[PDB]
Write an enzyme that holds these catalytic residues in place. Structure first.
Site, PDB file in Angstrom:
ATOM      1  N   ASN A  46      -5.866 -31.345  92.957  1.00  0.00           N
ATOM      2  CA  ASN A  46      -7.195 -31.647  93.945  1.00  0.00           C
ATOM      3  C   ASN A  46      -6.680 -32.921  95.306  1.00  0.00           C
ATOM      4  O   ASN A  46      -5.385 -33.586  94.785  1.00  0.00           O
ATOM      5  CB  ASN A  46      -8.267 -32.667  93.520  1.00  0.00           C
ATOM      6  CG  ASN A  46      -8.619 -31.328  92.070  1.00  0.00           C
ATOM      7  OD1 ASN A  46      -8.989 -30.108  92.155  1.00  0.00           O
ATOM      8  ND2 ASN A  46      -8.879 -31.750  91.272  1.00  0.00           N
ATOM      9  N   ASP A  52      -7.364 -29.615  88.160  1.00  0.00           N
ATOM     10  CA  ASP A  52      -8.125 -28.949  87.495  1.00  0.00           C
ATOM     11  C   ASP A  52      -7.213 -28.187  85.963  1.00  0.00           C
ATOM     12  O   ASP A  52      -6.493 -26.902  86.548  1.00  0.00           O
ATOM     13  CB  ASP A  52      -9.037 -27.919  88.445  1.00  0.00           C
ATOM     14  CG  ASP A  52      -9.709 -28.827  89.308  1.00  0.00           C
ATOM     15  OD1 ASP A  52     -10.303 -29.904  88.758  1.00  0.00           O
ATOM     16  OD2 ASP A  52     -10.640 -28.275  90.163  1.00  0.00           O
TER      17      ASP A  52
END
Ligand SMILES: [Cl-]
Ligand SMILES: [Cl-]
EC number: 3.2.1.17
Length: 129
Positions: A46, A52
């Site tokens: 990100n 993630d």
């Protein structure tokens, strides 16, 4: 591991996700399809420097420790690498905490934009469950 659609549905059902907090099984399968293409090894970085991880793309800013997201939390009390295992238990257990935190499945951007308000039952159609 790259799951098949019905294989993942059965695994999530066995781990208690069907109707968890009111979300039918198809919601979870749809979310996994668009978050990770059913691949437990998926990772994505990100803009803020968090990452993630895994089949449900759980974010290191809040939920797991990856040693490289300064100032972050580890609310699921796990190394982020545990979310990449072929055994989905850690991902499912952490997902139960996320979905209970007040915002439901809206925590998953792909669920909100690609699953919410669609016929999610299609994602489990044809599966022996
Ligand atoms: Cl469903
Ligand atoms: Cl909800």
């Amino acid at each position: 591991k790259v799951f098949g659609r019905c294989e993942l549905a059965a695994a999530m059902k066995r781990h208690g996700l069907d109707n968890y907090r009111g979300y039918s099984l198809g919601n979870w399968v749809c979310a996994a399809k668009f978050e990770s293409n059913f691949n437990t090894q998926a990772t994505n970085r990100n803009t803020d420097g968090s990452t993630d991880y895994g089949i449900l793309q759980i974010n290191s800013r809040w939920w797991c420790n990856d040693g490289r997201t300064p100032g972050s939390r580890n609310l699921c009390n796990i190394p982020c690498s545990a979310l990449l295992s072929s055994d989905i238990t850690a991902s499912v257990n952490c997902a139960k905490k996320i979905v209970s935190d007040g915002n439901g499945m809206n925590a998953w951007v792909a669920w909100r934009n690609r699953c919410k308000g669609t016929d999610v039952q299609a994602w489990i159609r044809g599966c022996r469950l």
